[PDB]
Amino acid sequence: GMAYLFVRLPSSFLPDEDQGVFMTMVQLPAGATQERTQKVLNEVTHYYLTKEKNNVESVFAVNGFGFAGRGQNTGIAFVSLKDWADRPGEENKVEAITMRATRAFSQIKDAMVFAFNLPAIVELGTATGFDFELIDQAGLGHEKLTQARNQLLAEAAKHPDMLTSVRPNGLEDTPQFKIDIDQEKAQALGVSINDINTTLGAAWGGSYVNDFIDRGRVKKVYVMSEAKYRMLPDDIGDWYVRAADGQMVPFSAFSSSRWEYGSPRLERYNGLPSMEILGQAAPGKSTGEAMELMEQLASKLPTGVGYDWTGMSYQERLSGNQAPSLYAISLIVVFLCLAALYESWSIPFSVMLVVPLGVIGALLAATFRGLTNDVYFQVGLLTTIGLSAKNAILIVEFAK
Amino acid sequence: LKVNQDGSRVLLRDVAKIELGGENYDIIAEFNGQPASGLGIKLATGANALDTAAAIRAELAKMEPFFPSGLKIVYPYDTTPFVKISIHEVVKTLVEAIILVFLVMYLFLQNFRATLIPTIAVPVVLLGTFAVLAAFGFSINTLTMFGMVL
C-alpha cells in the first residue's frame, strides 16, 4: 500500500504561499490605444477597490508596460494586499482573491482576465508546464514561420488528451501603414532622399537632437511635431519638404501609401527567427508525456520549420529522473554504515525494513490533507527515514 | 530659423510649441487612481541579501529631506515583510519546539534538574549550526531555517 499511496500522491516543487502581494496583467488586442487600454486598467482598479476593498491595500497600475508587448497596448497592476492578520479564512487569502478576480475580469472585451500569485520563488517558477520554440532553420520567413505555427497549434488543440492550453506569445500581427517614396518622381522634383526621411522620421517617430542643461542636469532635446498633425494617414500629406529649386513640395506629390502587415514583436532563438509556444502539461500527465507529442506534431510541419526547448523545459526534473538515482545512494550507503558498526551483512536488514513504516505515515498524512509530494515532503521523508533507523538501531543494538 | 525679406524674423517659437515634456509618453501609472511615478528595481545575478533593498532604503533615506511639497514615498509591492514574518514565524516555531520538549522531558522523569540537560543541549547545537553553515557559504534563509527544526 506504501508504493500505491506513493504512486498515487502527486508531486510539485514548492507551495505558492500567499505573499501579501501579487499582480494582475492586462493585455488589449492589436493596434489598441493607450486610451482604450486605460479603460481596461480602470475597470481593473475599480474591482480591487470596490468589490475587494476589504482585502486590497493598494493598487499600482501601469499603462504601457507589460511583461512583453510594451507600449500603448499592455498594462500591469501591482497589488498589495492588507496585512496578513486582517485577512483570516482562506477566503481572504491570495489564491482566493486572485481566483475571484480572474473570474471577474473574465467579462471584458479584452483578454487580460488574469492576475495570479508570485510563482513560488522569484524567477524560479520554472515548473508550470513547458516552453516550445519554433525555429526557421531554412531561408523561410515570418510568412511560413508563423504559417506553420497556426498549423502546429491546431494539431495540438485538436486532441486535449495529452496537451492543454497550447498558444503563442503576443506575436499578433497587426496592420502597418506602408509609405513608399517614388524615388525618381522625387529625385526629379528637386528633393533629396535625405531631407525626405529625416522629415518623415522627425515628425512621426521623434528625433533625439542635442542635450541641454535643465537645472544643472543634462537632459535631451526632442523634435517630433504636435499630436494633431500625426494621428491619421491623410495627415501624411500635410508635410512639405524643401526642394533644390527653392519651393516646398507635399509628400503626396512623391509617395504612395497602402496598408500592409507586419509583426510588432519579431523574435529569434539562437540567431534564427523563432516563435515561442507555451502550454500546460495535461490533466494527469507530466511534462515529458506532454512533450514527446509536441516533438511529433512538429515533424508534420512544413520543411525548414524546427524546434527546441528553453527555460522551463530544458531539463528533466526530480521525481522521474533525479531522486530515483540519488535516493538509491542514500539507502545504498545506509547498508554500509550499518555494517561499519554491526558487521553481519544480514543484520543491517532489520534496521532497513523499518523505513517503509514511517514512509506509510508520511504518505498517509500527505494524502489525507491537500498536501502534495514536493521538496519539503521529500526533505521530510528522509529525516523520517533517519528517525526510523534511529529507534530500530538502538533496539537492534542493545539486543546484540 | 531664418531672417525674412521684409526685415522680420521667424523663430523656433513660430513653428513649434515648446515645452518640457517626457522623453517618451508610453508609460504612465497611478497609485489608486492618483497620478504617480516610481522605481521598478531588480537584482544582479547572484545578487546579495535583502541587503539590496536594505541599501535601497539607504539612498532614499537621505533623499526624503530635500523633497518639495507634495512628494510622499509610498510602498506598494514589497518582498520585505515576508522575510521579516517568514523568520519570526519560525524562530517562534523553534522556541516553542523547545518549551514543548522541556515538557515531554518532565512528564517522564519528574526533575527540573534533569529535564534541564536536554534543555541545555539543543540550543548549543543549533548555534553551532549557523557556524558550520557560513563556513560553506549558505546563509540564514527562509529555506535553511526549516531543516533547522526538522
Binding site: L357, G361, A362, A366, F377, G380, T383 | -
Partner: peptide
Amino acid sequence: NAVGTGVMGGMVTATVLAIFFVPVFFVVVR
C-alpha cells in the same frame, strides 16, 4: 505545513509499529 505534516504523520506510524516489527524483522533476520 508541508514540512511538519509528513514529518508527524510518518513519525506516529513509525513509533507505533517499529516498536512491534523491529523486535521481529531482527529475530527473523537470523
